[PDB]
Design a binder for this molecule. Structure first.
Ligand SMILES: Cc1n[nH]c(C)c1-c1ccc(NC(=O)[C@@H](NC(=O)c2ccnn2C(C)C)C(C2CC2)C2CC2)cc1
Lengths: 98, 99
């Protein structure tokens, strides 16, 4: 029960040179703001070494960020939302295994 | 300039450490902003950690930047009313080949 008013009028190629490079995947949800979210997906299980080979002794892992979205509530009523918490992959890094 | 109503009642730990491009979180607090607390990544090194545990400058640690929205109180100090703002946030670091 904590309601506020929001004006929705608003204010690299690392993915490619990274030893843990990634692609983006589109998710669209018309009941959600933002409706389109791009999620990072690691290209490889391992990490690319200085020869351009995959080395599976290291791991590409996605960096997951807690992020909020607006969900329409009650549904289809266009002016009114609840804040939701989701986990989104924003990129990949290379970790030494445990 | 569409205005909407929002209910603010809401719905792998150690990468920062095991990464060849490791990083720390900096807390930035702004009481005029929701969320007021944002944790930003900063790369520990300009280079990347190699298999021996040393900084190797043949490669670069770079921040992963994500465009994110925050709520700014408008008019200021009025606690229940906001405009959406766009900012750039570092979420972590990756290791890139230079050119
Ligand atoms: C479009 C797209 N592609 N890939 C991603 C990820 C996204 C993509 C998806 C969603 C969003 N959401 C936000 O920006 C929300 N902001 C946060 O969640 C936020 C702000 C500060 N700190 N945070 C985190 C760190 C807690 C925002 C709500 C949607 C209006 C603000 C109100 C609370 C931003 C990009």
């Amino acid at each position: 029960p904590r309601t506020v008013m929001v004006n929705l009028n608003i204010h690299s190629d690392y993915y490619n040179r990274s030893t843990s490079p990634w692609n983006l995947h589109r998710n669209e949800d018309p009941e959600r703001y933002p409706s389109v979210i791009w999620e990072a997906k690691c290209r490889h299980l391992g990490c690319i070494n200085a020869d351009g080979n995959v080395d599976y002794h290291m791991n590409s892992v996605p960096i997951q960020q807690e992020i909020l979205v607006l969900r329409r509530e009650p549904p289809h009523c266009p002016n009114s939302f609840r804040l939701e918490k989701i986990l989104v992959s924003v990129g990949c890094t290379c970790v030494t295994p445990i």
